[PDB]
Amino acid sequence: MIRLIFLDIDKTLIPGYEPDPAKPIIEELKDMGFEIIFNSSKTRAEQEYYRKELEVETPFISENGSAIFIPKGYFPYIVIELGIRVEKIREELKKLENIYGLKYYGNSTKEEIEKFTGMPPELVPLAMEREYSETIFEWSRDGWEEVLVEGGFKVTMGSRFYTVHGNSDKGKAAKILLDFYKRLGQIESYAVGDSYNDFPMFEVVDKVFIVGSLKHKKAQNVSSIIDVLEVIKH
């Protein structure tokens, strides 16, 4: 049987932006025989950095399930796009930008982005390589969300800011990836997250953990990712 776990990153796997704290977690999960799938709002460029740093070479899912990346020849990258291109999102944000005082990646400076996100300077370039979504760092007037929703977009609160994306989510992407594993055998699925963008995942796995206080029906709350591992041991 295949044990697979979907791991969110920000505010779930690591405290901040440095990968180091997660090394022990990934090693332990690997020793326990898990297939570790990152499923984060982070861009593919950002996740490739974490993957390389943590030696994770499994499929991963980016920008709130907007795309599934499967390493060439992984199953006995191949990209499955499920969201919408970021240029279409920016076209609409541009129209709303000066109506709602919006600040997002496309209209903010590296400096602003660092201040908004608390991101280490050297990592900001990976965050700016967006393919299917935007992040709203701030606004000066409410109402833009309703407008984007009616325009066909999804607005989902993440670990730090709202994310504007297309017609997909972490669960739709997880569900599709889970089918690939099912062709290989029986699966015991887990999901670990921390915010609203993680809810769609919870609806598709057997066991669910939430790091922090956000409550969810099918989810068991814990204070940290370490706890998740302890619980799993049993």
* CA angle in degrees (0–180, nearest 5) for 181-163-100: 165
Q: Judged by CB under 5 A, which of 64, 66, 108, 159 binds Mg ion?
A: 159
| 46 is a site residue for Mg ion (CB under 5 A) | no
| 10 is a site residue for Mg ion (CB under 5 A) | yes
Q: Are 25 and 229 in contact (CB under 8 A)?
A: yes
Residue whose entry in the numeric block shows the structure tokens 């129209």: 95
State the minimum distance, in angstroms, from the CB of residue 201 to Mg ion: 11
Enumerate the β-bridge partners of residue 6.
37, 191
- Strands 154-157 and 34-38, sheet pairing: unpaired
| 133 is a site residue for Mg ion (CB under 5 A) | no
Q: Are 130 and 46 in contact (CB under 8 A)?
A: no
**CB closer to Mg ion out of 29 and 192:** 192
142 is catalytic: no
| 169 is a site residue for Mg ion (CB under 5 A) | no
| 8 is a site residue for Mg ion (CB under 5 A) | yes
Q: Judged by CB under 5 A, which of 5, 6, 7, 11 binds Mg ion?
A: 11
Amino acid at 3: R
**CB closer to Mg ion out of 8 and 46:** 8
Q: Tell me which stretch binds Mg ion (CB under 5 A): 12-20, 74-82, 146-154, 203-211.
A: 12-20
| Subset of residues 178 to 207 that bind Mg ion, contact rule: CB under 5 A | 194
| 35 is a site residue for Mg ion (CB under 5 A) | no
State the minimum distance, in angstroms, from the CB of residue 113 to Mg ion: 18
**CB closer to Mg ion out of 100 and 228:** 228
Residue numbering of the annotated binding site? 8, 10, 159, 194
Enumerate the β-bridge partners of residue 3.
34, 188
State the minimum distance, in angstroms, from the CB of residue 41 to Mg ion: 7
The one catalytic residue in 8, 142, 169, 206 is 8
Residue numbering of the annotated binding site for Mg(2+)? 8, 10, 159, 194
State the Cα–Cα distance between residues 134 and 136, nearest whole angstrom.
Answer: 7
* DSSP structure string for 25-87: HHHHHHHTTEEEEEB-SS-HHHHHHHHHHHT--S-EEETTTTEEEE-TT----EEEE-S--HH
Which of 41, 62, 44, 6 has its CA nearest to residue 196?
41
| 135 is a site residue for Mg ion (CB under 5 A) | no
Which of the residues are catalytic? 8
Q: Which residues bind Mg ion (CB under 5 A)?
A: 8, 10-12, 159, 194
